[model samples]
Target: GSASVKNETVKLSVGTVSGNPGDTVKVPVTISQVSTPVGLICMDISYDASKFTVKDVLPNTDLVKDTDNYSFIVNTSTPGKISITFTDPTLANYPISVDGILAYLDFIINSNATAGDSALTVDPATLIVADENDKDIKDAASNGKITVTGSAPTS
Candidate 1:
């Protein structure tokens, strides 16, 4: 097996954007860099489902979906946890070399969501980055935060 080119780190950012309680929020998930060849990617994100509902999960990169043999699934079975997986047996032939935005998780802020911060975190235990050797590759993960702005109601 080859050593990692560099330990990659995953991050999420929405800039300084702040949305209303009832607005839908968009956050882009990015991969800092890729030092090793990766074949499979499985990730799970946890957020305040009470404050927001899963609107959509958008794939931003074509690392694993370059072929027709890929299978992608987004699981929202858990109340506050969202799981995503993309598997391809052919990635072994074409491992990921570069890195960029991996995907985007869209969330609609609950109308009753309070005006405050909602933490968006990646569940490390649920990450599975299968390398070229079919061994699991562990990388650094980061969490995100967003603010909800609320307006006063007329009395």
Candidate 2:
């Protein structure tokens, strides 16, 4: 076997974003390889918010779809690309669809700012998710990322 980037599927995760309570925002996330009979959850998710600056092509960035688990973050810093990473992996068991593609999240306008740069601490967010039809041990279809437009405010 050889390593390459022919059809390289870039994996990523929505990192935590700080927001000032009750500030809904938007973002964009891309995803792939999802279908019935979800494979083992060898979750592979990550992000480099300091590097992953996603731009929405349409309305707003979609959050994790699974009607179960979801929590996203928005980087209200600037415009650029960010790298992503995974939280808990189950590759040995349910290892497919970036976190089993079972659950994902979306970010809203957050403001927990820090005095340093008026920045705050927030939770890392997700993008795609599965339907409630999925049980602790079940199957769900994998979906793509959600794209959100507009600049998020800071304060």
Candidate 3:
């Protein structure tokens, strides 16, 4: 039986992304761009419209949309990806500072939907894994130091 992949993995990452605001750097992504698979179902990377927010990393801003073995996303995080490819970009919410990565144009993944040009689609890749790239935590406005009680230390 010729079967298509129903469950796919997504590969997401910040790569060279920056957490600075007022930056206009666009993220680069490698999707199953302008390619096709011999499967029956069309699968690709996509952002959860219901989970996205434009605020960029607010409290509880993890885009979580569950669609039949799928999670969800929102527009609040820095940036997301994979929508109608070809002349369109990935999730356009990821804010960039001067130190941010420059985004690409006219490249589309398998799952994205752009306004112009056709012929590319998305196929579930891998999930964007979490990372320890929190370089801002040390500079965030805190009481200035961590606290400890006897033998226990707390922030």
Candidate 4:
């Protein structure tokens, strides 16, 4: 594995959030300082399955542009882990070079979630930011924290 060029580094970040049990919260995944134009971005995010239930994952059209030109896969089959892959089907062209919110995930706070902080960690081993030439360009990954407060409403 060759070293990444200083100017070609990419950054992935998950924003912090807080909500009450039973509430649905949206977590945004932002891409920043994409100095290199990439054609693929793959990663795995792990969370406390007992405290959060993932609802959906959607790409931000503003940055992803055409859905038909890209391949976006979100797999939640494994407990507490979410594997995501976003890439151009052609493996070239339509590079994502700008910085912005790449995608957002909706999660429902489990009714039995305790009042505390749950970490949303990005698995570095699975993180991939590949440029148009299929070269890795990943640099930094910032994980997020979800704070659960209050309690589930009585039915």
Give the backbone clash total of model 3. Answer: 36
- Report the lDDT tens digits of candidate 2 across residue range 5-28: 112223433333333333343332
RMSD of each: 3.5, 12.9, 19.7, 3.8
The candidates, ranked best first by lDDT, are 4, 1, 2, 3
Which predicted model would earn the best TM-score?
A: 4
The TM-score ranking, best first, is 4, 1, 2, 3
lDDT of 4 by residue, 40-151 (tens): 7788888889889889888987667666764777877589899987876653345567788888888888888887788778888888878766777777665767888856
- Listed in order, each prediction's TM-score against the native is 0.78, 0.23, 0.20, 0.85
Superposed model 2: Cα runs more than 4 Å off: 1-8, 11-23, 26-28, 33-85, 98-155
**In terms of TM-score, how similar is model 4 to the real structure?**
0.85
In model 4, residue pairs whose N, Cα or C atoms come closer than 3 Å (at least 3 residues apart or on different chains), thus clashing, are none
The residue ranges of model 4 lying beyond 4 angstroms of the native Cα positions read: 1-7, 90-93, 151-155
lDDT by candidate, in order shown: 0.67, 0.28, 0.21, 0.76
Task: Give the residue spans of candidate 1 off by over 4 A.
Answer: 1-17, 66-68, 92-94, 151-155
